[PDB]
Every structure is written in structure tokens, then in C-alpha cells.
Symmetry: D3
Subunit: 309 residues, 6 copies
């Protein structure tokens, strides 16, 4: 009942409402010292958007994902699954990373040291952004513990820009391969629909072709691409068409549906995913929490494919 959500309400009463007792993601228990806990998975918020080239507001993403997640908490077995992920995984929400707002360098180092300490304690990580730069420190900690990783990357942009400043949310996947964190030749970038480089190692499955092909065919290609490398899964929510995810800093039309998106994440269940994150929710631009809702449903789906093991 602790690790379920029966235990994070007033008087520890099971809150059946899709509204009340909205604190931790999915009403999962708060543990602000997660390093010595009995958690299998530790949810972290990264309230950061200093590395944005478009709209800011990403700093409020972790809160929005948590707030809207009460819509999913009532499902004992989250559809369409035949078990409860809370019975299989012990998940805690450790709150948001504390850093000096206006110091991206302090954010970077403290986030890297946070992950390094979790991973060294045998805890796995589901992380909420924040702009997509937060994924770089996370990959620096993950590469140290799990080795070089295949990147499964849901996005409208490839973020492989070579001539940006240090704190730039469009330069993580130029920097990660350069530092030997990820292998481009085993990495896949799904839903791309902005200018990208073709003759790097990355396999780009653009939104045009992904919206035309079947989910099972895209999945089969992804399964082959990654091989047997440990996967880091990163979902930029601007992968979804702005009709489904208006609340992003860099929106691009001709994106994926929320249906196609959840089906693709659902289908990655057989892979070795060591870490994952959902980034770039900007609630200042969200409409009736639909962007936040997509991020939270995808976040819960990521936990369910780990529980599927």
C-alpha cells in the first residue's frame, strides 16, 4: 500500500478522484532522500529552460506532469496492460533538483552528481524536464554506470548542432557521441521534421514516413538498429504535432498523434532501457493540460514497459 498511492493522502485513504491529493507523480510517495530508499525507480524534476532557443517556460514542466498525472492514478492496471506497475516496481518521486536559477553550470554539475549517486545506489531513473539540455548531464552519469548507450530519441529536431554555446538544448547529440556517451550507429531519431544531417551515424525516421508506416514496422526497424546495446530513451514532447502538444518551446507542424506515440513507446517493451526522460513541456503555452497529459501518460507507459520485464 506504500509504493501504491494508498499512503500519500490525508489519513492514508485511497483517493479514487481524478483531482485531489496531487503531490508526487501518480500520487507516488515523496522521498527527498531517495539514495538509501527501497526504490527500484526514482522520478526527478529538472526545473530548467535557460538553454532554450525558442519559448521559455520548460521550468514548470515537472509540476504540470505531476499535477495532471492524477487523471491516470485511478487505473489499477493502466490500459491496456494486464497488471499494476506499482505492484512490480517500487517508484518514489524525489521532488525537483535545487540549483541557483541563472546558473546553468551549477544545474549541470548538480544534476550529474544527483544521477551518479542514484545509479551508484542501484536505482534507475525516470526524469522530467525542463528543456532537452538536462538529458546531456543525465547521459554523462548513465554512460559511466552502464557504458556507451543506443539513444532512442523522440523529437521534431535532431539536436546535433556543432556550433552552439555550451548551454544549448540543440547540441546534446553532437556532444554525447563526441564524449562517447552514445553510439550514433545504434541510435534512432523518430518524428524528425526540421533540417537535419544525413551522413552522421544516426538513423532518422522522419514524421512524414512515420505517419505513413505501421507502428509494428517502425518498432521492428528500431529493435534491429539498437542491437543489444543498453538503451537510453528520451522523449521530447514536440515529437507530438502541436495539435496534441501545443505547450512546447519549439513547436513544428506535421507531427505524430498521441495514439501513434503511445503505441511506439508501448512497442519498445522488449529492449534493455537503463534510463529514460520526458522533456520540453512548457505549461505557459499548454491548453487544458493536454501537453502535460501526453507527457504523464508517456511517462507512465515508460514505467509499464520496465514492469513488463
Amino acid at each position: 500500500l506504500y509504493f501504491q498511492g494508498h499512503m500519500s493522502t490525508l489519513g492514508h485513504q485511497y483517493d479514487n478522484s481524478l483531482v485531489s491529493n496531487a503531490f508526487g507523480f501518480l500520487r507516488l510517495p515523496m522521498n527527498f532522500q531517495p539514495y538509501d530508499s527501497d526504490a527500484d525507480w526514482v522520478i526527478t524534476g529538472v526545473p530548467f529552460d535557460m538553454a532554450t532557443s525558442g519559448r521559455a517556460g520548460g521550468r514548470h514542466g515537472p509540476a504540470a506532469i505531476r499535477q495532471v498525472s492524477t487523471n491516470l492514478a485511478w487505473e489499477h492496471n493502466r490500459f491496456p496492460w494486464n497488471f499494476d506497475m506499482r505492484e512490480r516496481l517500487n517508484v518514489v518521486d524525489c521532488g525537483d533538483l535545487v540549483y541557483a536559477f541563472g546558473d546553468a553550470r551549477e544545474m549541470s554539475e548538480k544534476l550529474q552528481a544527483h544521477a551518479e549517486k542514484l545509479l551508484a545506489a542501484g536505482k534507475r531513473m525516470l526524469s522530467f524536464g525542463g528543456d532537452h539540455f538536462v538529458t546531456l548531464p543525465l547521459l554523462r552519469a548513465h554512460a559511466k554506470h552502464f557504458g556507451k548507450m543506443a539513444l532512442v530519441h523522440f523529437d521534431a529536431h535532431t539536436d546535433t548542432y556543432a556550433n552552439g554555446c555550451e548551454f544549448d538544448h540543440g547540441t546534446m547529440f553532437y556532444t554525447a557521441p563526441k564524449e562517447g556517451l552514445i553510439d550514433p550507429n545504434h541510435s534512432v531519431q523518430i518524428g524528425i521534421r526540421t533540417e537535419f544531417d544525413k551522413d552522421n551515424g544516426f538513423t532518422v525516421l522522419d514524421a512524414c514516413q512515420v505517419n505513413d508506416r505501421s507502428v509494428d514496422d517502425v518498432i521492428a526497424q528500431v529493435k534491429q538498429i539498437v542491437g543489444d546495446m543498453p538503451v537510453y530513451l528520451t522523449f521530447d514532447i514536440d515529437c507530438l504535432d502541436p495539435a496534441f502538444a501545443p505547450g512546447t518551446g519549439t513547436p513544428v507542424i506535421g507531427g505524430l498523434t498521441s495514439d501513434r506515440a503511445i503505441k511506439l513507446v508501448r512497442g519498445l517493451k522488449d529492449l534493455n532501457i537503463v534510463g529514460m526522460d520526458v522533456v520540453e513541456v512548457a505549461p505557459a503555452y499548454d491548453q487544458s493540460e493536454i501537453t502535460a497529459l501526453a507527457a504523464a501518460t508517456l511517462a507512465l507507459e515508460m514505467l509499464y514497459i520496465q514492469a513488463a520485464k
Copy 2:
């Protein structure tokens, strides 16, 4: 209709009754074939409230549809085949859910006993239960065609719970689950009842024509009650609802499905869970309004 009873070609002005249809606040002894009733109720919601403003938002946006003499893609005017009146909204003591339930059933029972039929606007989905209780008394046991992200077959809810109507309605002999279909479902459901659950995942993958064919086989020749929860539509098309769930139907798939149910003997129908407080540029109200008009056009198709 309008000031000076002048034909209003605008998509804006003289927004009163749904589709600028005549207001008849005493519709029981009227010449009407079909009666539009608003149920301004959301006390049985488990998610967001705001459903109480549902009927108003659906009426206001319906001016967008009114100018169409023949509504696309139909070859006739449904107003030339049906006398439809808008009888206003149910008056009940707000905060008294029991009084709502009693007054809605009596209203419906009085309408049906006058040989009138009912297109109802919610309001949360609990309003369907009083509507089913009255329809059952006049039309007997019914087949349920139920568009939704949720099955609403919960057995441990309080009396006024918008997730319990289709646990209670089978028990009360109002509907036959074995001839009932549930379309758009994408939240935890009990597989081991009579209902055929056509989940959003498969309905989005399958063809519209092969979904329709299967619905027809299930319902058979039973008289249908057509209930449309608007959170069936993906929050991208229907943000203005109390319990949104991602991975839902497009408005295109939704209208095509409702359009292809014309051959069924549909005795009653409603559109529920429109929450204008959460709606964006009236796109949810519009979908609810357009689907409601489609329901009158499939009745007119007879």
C-alpha cells in the same frame, strides 16, 4: 428564431435554441417529433466539473451549422423531415443531485408518453441513467452504442457517480450488455461482462467501414440508445471535457462512425461531458454540436 423572423445567413447572430430551432418551454403538447433538452449537471464528476455549462456552449456554437440548408454530406434538409424544438434546460435545485435525477426522468417519461423522441445535451454522463430509466419504460430493454474513453461499469461508486451508469443500467434491466458496443475505450475496463469493447487503439488502426459492420452485427435489430461521451475524441479535438485521455478518435473518424449508424433503429440519444471552462476556441462544443446534428440527420435518413 430571429428579430422580425428574418432569415439569418450569419454564423454568429441570433444564437438562442440549438441550430436556431424554435424555443418551446412546454414541448409536451407541441407538434415536435424530436425534443432537445439541456441537463446543466456535473455533481457526479470524478475529474473536472464545468459540464453544467455544456448545453449553452453547444447551442451558442451551433450557429456555425445553421446556414447549411442541406448539412454535408446529406442530400436533404433534416428540418423539412423533422419538427425539432429546443425546450430549454432542466430546472433542479443545484446541489440536489437526487432532485435532478427525479425531475429528468419525469420530464423524459412525459415527453415519450406524448410520442416525442429526445436528443439530450449534458452535463456529466450520469444524466444518461435517468434518460435510460424513462426510455426503458416506453421502448423496453435497449442496445447501448456508447462512445467514450471510459466504460463506466464501476460497482463501488456512490449513488451519483458518472462512472457507474452502465453497471446500474444492466442490473435495472434497462439495457442488454450482450448487444451493447463501447467505442473509443482506452482506460482500464472489466473484460468479463457482456459488452463488446472496441478500444481506441484498434478503432484508430482498423477501417471505419469494418468497425460499422461489426457494431451492426452486435446490436442486431434491438432498439438502440446512442450515448456519446465527448472525451471519446482525443483531447486535441475535445480539450473541453472533465476527464481527458490521450490516444482518442479524430473528429473525422467520430462523425464517419455516427454517420454509418443510420440503418440502426435509434429510439433516443445524447452528447455529454462538454466542459466549456476547459474548451479552446469552442472546438469541443462544435464537435458535440456537429455530432448532435449528425444524430438528427441519421433519424431524418429514415
Copy 3:
């Protein structure tokens, strides 16, 4: 008076105590789409028109928004702070919205003037909902023929005395109205003005800067003096209110009146002989939680109460 109190404006003719449902006619007053031969003392007309706007359009939705939000004021049997019910003292019907070819401002002008003259020539008085402020000029033309030259009690951030610009221009009515002998500038006051105006015309401009500092009683005393004892036409542009209170308008100007000051000022005009009145420039596309519409509905209701006070 049950018909005119809104006991017959709901399903089964049941009194709706809720601030939500049966939102049709303003304040749930009965719909009369042929109001000319009715028992109505006062007739409410929507003018869904914004073609004459210089800023944002969307004024055309003003009438509908004012009606929908007005259910918030219906539950009060005696509207505060009055000790009677205006619905029991006045027969008030809502005749709906003016039907005109959208994109034809001339037809709007002619049909509105024809509609108004027919109401006045039937012994009815008019409370009109805009729409942009140009709707006042057709209404002033109808009123001028029936009651004679009037005193304009004008609430606005703008004087709208522009002697240039095209015919269908919502900043020109009160240059045109004096020229056609519809109003007397000498007995006219413009309240809330905080945009460039002509000082040396006959109008008395009580700018928002001084109106915000001065007492209500003192502004009221001055307005009473300016009008004299001529018949008054009361036009209220909602953008008179600060954007804080009325964000839903086409031409917002900061440093406006509070809703508290505006409702008090109209309340203090009760002694004046107001022969016709309107509320204009509600643009619901730019409104925020119906706060502009609510202001327009309350002020419009106050205009009916200061007629009922007599």
C-alpha cells in the same frame, strides 16, 4: 408580471435560481422576436456588428456574451443596492439580434434605424447591446426624430469626434451626430476620456485622470448641470473601464475607471430623463473569464433600474 419576470423563460415555466441554466434572453427576460405590438415598456436589441472598428474586431459576439453572463444577476429578486425589482415595475422583452447581410454596413445602418423608429413609433424605449460604437449613430438618428435633439451622457476612453475617416467609422459618430442635429454638444459630457481629444468643441470632457481622483457625488452634480433638463441618450463604451476590468474590447487604454466607480456613476444618473441607452464595444474573443461581459450586463441592468426608480 410573471411572463416579464422570467418565470416563463425556462423548461416547464419553473423559476431558475441557478446562475447557469436557461441562458437565452438577457436576465432570462422573455424572447419577443416581434416586439413592436407587445406590452413591453423597454426592448433589448443585440447589434452583432464590428465592421466599423479601427482596432480589434469581435464586437459582433458582444450581445451573446452579455446575455450568457447575465444569469449571474437574475437570482437577485431586488438587485443590490435597490429595494425594489425592476422586472415588476418594467415590462422588458429581448427581441434578439438585428438580421443584416454580414459585410454590408449600409444595410445594418438602414435596418437598425428602421427597427429603432418602429419601436419608438410603437411607444417602446430601447436598451441596445453592441457591437462597435458606430451602432449608436443609427440609434441617435431614430431617437432624434422622436424625442428631438438630446444631451449625450457618453462613457468612453475616446471622444469619437474624428471629422475625417470613412462613413462606417466607430470614432466619428459624435462629429456626425451634432452635424445632423441629433445631439447638443453644449449639454453633452464625455466621461473616462484618456486619449487625445478636441478641447474647443461644445462637449464637456471629464478625463479619467480627474474622474479617478474626484468624488462620485461631484462628477454626478456636474453631469446634472451640463445636461440641464433636455432628454438624455446614455451611450456606454465598456473601454471606459480600465483593461483590468474590461480586457475584452477592441481599443483598450490604461488608466481607466474601476467597475465600482462606473456602476456608482450610472446609479447617480437616476434623476435624469434618459429616453434611450446602449452598452457597446464588448469583444468576447479578448474577454478573460467573462469579466468584461459581466461589467456590461451589470451596468445595462443598472440602466434599467434607474428607469424603474421613477
Copy 4:
């Protein structure tokens, strides 16, 4: 210690959980708390717009704007130095059952008061105040009501669960004394010949802060006070996020100054109600409620 790694969060954004990032205590009855914050996610008794059920969460979320202030303006101490405040979460009741809410909130309130704890409560619609008054009156006896609202809510022929009937019922049950009670900001039809003293928005906006405050102190005398604040007391310009808005209301300046000047009153319990986030604009209603809520703890801390 309500942040990751128990670090001091100087931002006005991060770690937005308990009100003002105060410690979460879901079993606060046997705790060390002087004051307990409860959320009541309820809006079934609403006559206008619903959406009050999200009130508690929106007040908590926006309260990150106020937490960075060690001495919240304009005070010369920290209320966390003098008071031990805890956020006990939201009342768990069956959504659709108004009776379950009422009984469980009274039981919650009665256990807190019997345990020596005092209650700041966020609504939710104003009906929640009656179960809270029922609890308070058992423990503290008959009370004076300092009531901020656009409405007097003294309706006599409403249904059981009506957010406009509490202050007909509360004198009827001997919970409050109208003769020592005041209703500040009323600008809607009210009954004149009840014991209540109504300081309507019209006279309050015209009169000075000091002369209004002095009159309120005269009325209450030395009676134990229950302070209740319906946010629609504020003008829709300042509080657009509410179920039943009325124009010609109080400014946030005048409102915070009135609450700040009630500090020498014997206030035994208080609440802030009718925040409806669905109708809010950039959280300014939530912020006003949240700021008023902290002000109420500071006037308690000043003692």
C-alpha cells in the same frame, strides 16, 4: 526539508508541493504542529460555475512566489520561527457524495481541535465552512464571524448542500452570533433585519482602511472569531478565478490591509474558499488567496 537533498530552494518555481513548501504530514493529529493546512476539493454545492475542487492545489502551486520571503512583507519576523505549520493534504471523500464530504471534514476538524491543533483550510466552495464551524463551535463555543464575500449566504430555503445557506444554518445551530458578526464586501441582495452588520463593497471602497477596521473590532468585541474569506470578495479584475463573480469589489491592496489590521482579534480558526482555477488568469486569483492565507498565519504568529 521539503526539497531534493533537503536544499534551500531560493527559486519561485521549484519543489511546489505543500503550501509555502511547508512539511507534508498526512497524519498531523499526533504531530508537533501549532497550525494544520487542509484542502477540501469540493464544488457540488455551487449555484454558479463549478471548478472550486481544484482550489487547494492552485493555492499550493502558486505559493512558491511567497516562500522565498524570510520575513514576508511587511512583517519584522518569520511566521515559521514562531508557528510550526504542516500541510496534511486534501480530504479524501467519494466524489458525488456531498454528505460523506461534510461528515468526514467535521470528523477531521474535531480530531485536529481535540489534539490541540488549529486549522487553516482551503476550499473548494463556501459550504465547507459549515462543517468547519460545526467542529470549531463544539471546541471553542459560539463564535463571531468576520466574513469576506460579495454575498451574505444567509438563504433559508436552499437544499441541504447549498454554498449560499451556511450563515442561515450556523446561527440556527448556535455556531455563530450574528450580533458580533460582520460581512465585508457585500454587493448582492442581502437580508437587512438579521443581527449581521453588512459593510457593503460600496462603503468599504469609499471609507478608509483604518475606520473600517476600528468598526469591525467594535462589533466582534472579545468573542472568539472564525475568519472566512470567499475570494469573490475581491473584484473580478483581481479574482477572476471564482464560480460567482460580482463587479465593484475590493482591491487586493484594501483586502490584505483589512486582514493585516485584524491581528489583535482572538481568531480561533480560518479558511479561504471559492478559488476556481479553471476560470483563473495567470494564477492571480490563486496568488491573492495564497497571499491572504499567509497573512492569516502572520496575524496568528504576531501573538
Copy 5:
């Protein structure tokens, strides 16, 4: 077109001309191949107004696209092939629709005569009628490739009505209905007027290639005027529009259907009916911005390297 003529790689700053292109308020005598004109006008609307803010909304949001050297999925920069200038917005007395109509045509005739081509941002769809009057003088009778939820072939109506241009234009001999296609229609339409209607229902169920294959067959060898009404897109993608109709196109299918008209002789074009007061997080304006950029790219593609 930035402070100190520095390259602004941000998706935010220096949002003046469409895609930060140079402003040329007197473009007639310039080196321009393609001139962008804002027509801030919505007086002919029968639904909501606010289309007057369309051009500005399209310009502001266009910063999201400027950073792309080669706009996806193209293999060239359209700016390296076409000299493009934004000439600002048409200046007419607000409340005078005839002045707008006369000045928009007069402006259009001057550009065409000087050897400039036109990409025009609306504004309600009536702006297309004065444009076809200028284009039909310079290019003769044209084929209309029409993206819309409405056919706008309404006989009757007033003079200035955004649902009548394509009843008026054939009568005056600006367009040939028999070589004209109307894609995305999902409201009452006239079946026998020469126009080939491809309704949203069939468009959504058919393949992009097979619709493109048919559109080529219809327009023939005629010079094409491409007019995109943004309400062609489903309100889920284009909520900021005066007359929304449900069951529209995805932005995906829309850009895919335009992208596949690259071989057609498109002489002029416009994007209309963006009403920013009803838009949500600039998604309608962004669709209008992205589609406008695509229209320049199918001209940059059909023009050589």
C-alpha cells in the same frame, strides 16, 4: 534584418518581416522575385472577425522556421534561389471595404507589371478576389487550386462577402471552374458548377499521391492560382479561424498535398482566414507560416539551382 546585421539563430528575436526577410515598403522597383503582402481585413466575414491580425501573427511565429538553412525536407535554401521581400501591410480606411478592394488590386497590378510575383497573407478570403482581378489581367484566365472547408460559390450575399469570390471570379472570367479543384470541403456545396470538389471525408481516406495525381489532371496546362483557407485544416490543428468545421485535414496531410504540387505552374498564391484572437499557442499561425514557406519552396524547386 537584425541589430548590427548579425545572424539571429534564435527562434524568438528580431520578428519583423516574414522569416526575418528584408522589409521593402516600395517593392515595385526592387530586385525582388517574390513580394509578401499583408492584407489586414475581415469586414467580409460571416462568422468570427479578427482575421485583420492574420499577417502579423504569421510574421511573428515565422521565427520558428528561419533557423533552418534547408527547410525540411528540401535539399536547398529557397533564399539562395528567390529574392524575397516583405512590403508590409495594405493601408486602407478601416470601415471602407471598397477602398481595400480597389487599393489591393491597384497594388497587385503594379507588382505584376514590374515583374514581381505575389505571396499574400490574409485576412478573410475576400482579399483573393481583388488579387485574381490583377492576376487575370497579367496571366489571363487561371486554374484555381483551392484548399478550404467551404466552396465559397454563394450566389446572392452582399458585395463584400468572404463566401462569394468563386461565384464572382468565374463570371468576370478570372478563373475556369472546369480546370479548378476545391480540396477539404465538408459543408453544403453546389455539385454542378464545373468545380471538381474533393471533400475532407474522401481526402482523409485516400492516399496523398492519388489526390496529387488527380489535381494535376484537372488543372491541365493552365497557369495556377493557389489559395489556402486555413480552416481547410481540422480545428484541432487550426482553431484560430472565423468559421471552423470539424473533420478537417491534419497539418501533415496539408503540407504533404501542397509539397506534391511542385511541378504545377503556380503564378500567384495566398494563405487566408488566420484569426489570432481564437488561435492557441500560435499553432494556426504556425501552420499558415509553414505552408507559406512551403509555397515559396515549390517555386524555388520549380525554379533551378
Copy 6:
């Protein structure tokens, strides 16, 4: 004019480019301008909500509501007739590099002031003012700060790029004299024991505009004044579009009257900061900022004569 064909645009909508439809001058250093408007699209220093980067563009777009007034109320002349004002667009820095912003803004500010141009700057968060003070202090010497805000921003234990620290760093670096400086509208925890005179929101609301202006004039005396206006000085009802809102602020009425009354002061530079359009409601925050911006140009034109 800055319109299609250089025509007079009397509309409050169209040709929305430079602030108040003033001419765009991207190289203003050698121009005939008296006053230059610069956008600083930067919000990286914020401790609350971000969005300030879009502030400059929002202020420009809303300023069309003010341009039609030849003599802006309640003035008896045109500032555009007395002052030569240009908009030089927005500062171009690598987004995510706060250091580059600071250095490039100072160098830009020093170059303008070295050429005899005066600065009206739009933020962006309030940190942008520290680079501006460094530049002004080099050309004018130590200045009296007239500072409208809900916050004093004198925090001594923040990171380098922090929007709540400028007026601790500024007096330390000899840019401003606290003893001749005033902070108007404060309603948050503040240090009382610094040289600054704090006129908190509660007292300013209770006092007459006359007696407050009288106090400010005495404090500054005859030192060169830098007028910096954080828009959150206004109550969130008037300015919801801000990053760190605080209830119980000034009305837009009181705020303009207070600025209007500073006309006799020697104000050498000025800025308006912390407009976050993501949190604005029907542009009312941008309008207030744009109107207060225009008022600052009028009190300069008034003093100039």
C-alpha cells in the same frame, strides 16, 4: 513612413513593426536619432516564470493602439516632432549564453552613448539593466536610480546572472548612489539599512501622487537619473504578464501619473522590463508597458521643449 507605399496608417492594427510605427534603424550609431529603442530578448536570470524574452516583440505589437494619437493624452505636443526616435530591433546573442548578452548589450549601449544617442530599452528580465547601468555610468558618471518594482533586487548571495541582485552589484561598482536613489511599489521583504529610500506599495496607494513625486524629486536632487520600471510594480490585475507577480500593487492610473510627474528630472537613460507575454491577458501588460514607455519619451520631449 514604415508602411506599404509609405502611407499614413490611422488603424490600431496594421503595419505593426517598430515601436509606435517608428522607423527601423539596425545601424543607429551614425543616424540623426536623439533616442534609440533596443529590445533585449533575455529571461535567463529569472527566479520565477520565464517568458520575458518575448517582451520586446509584445510591446512593439501593442504600441499600434498609441500611434494614432498625434498629441498623446494628456500632452499638448507630439514627441515625434521634438525627438527623433528609431527602433534598432533586438540585441543578437547566443541563447543560453547570459555572459554574451551582458557584454554585447554593454558594448551596444557604450557605442550608442559614445555617438550621443540616448537609450529607451525593452526587456527581458531586470538583469539587463546592470549591463545598461555600466554603459551609462562610463558616459554620465554615478547616477540616482528611480526604480519602480514590487522587489528591491539587492540580494547579495545570488549567482552572477540573477535578476534580483543588480542594485547590490550596481552601487558596489560605483554606477548608482543609493542615498539619491528611490524604490517605488515594494511589497516584498527588503533591507531597510541600505542608503535606498523604499516607498512601499501600501503607503504609495494611501498617499497622493503629488506628495510622492515631491519626495522623489528631493531624494534625487540634481544627480543624473536612470529610470528603470519593472512592470510587476503594477498589481497583477493590471500586469498579469510578469515572471514574479505580487498582489497589492499600483493601478496603471497611479503608475502613469507618477512617471508623468518625474518630467522635471534629468533622466539620462530608462528601460521597461519583466513583460512576459506567455502570462499576459489580452495584451493588457504589454499595453501598460508600451504606454509607460511612450510616457517616458513625452517627459523627455517635455523637458527638451
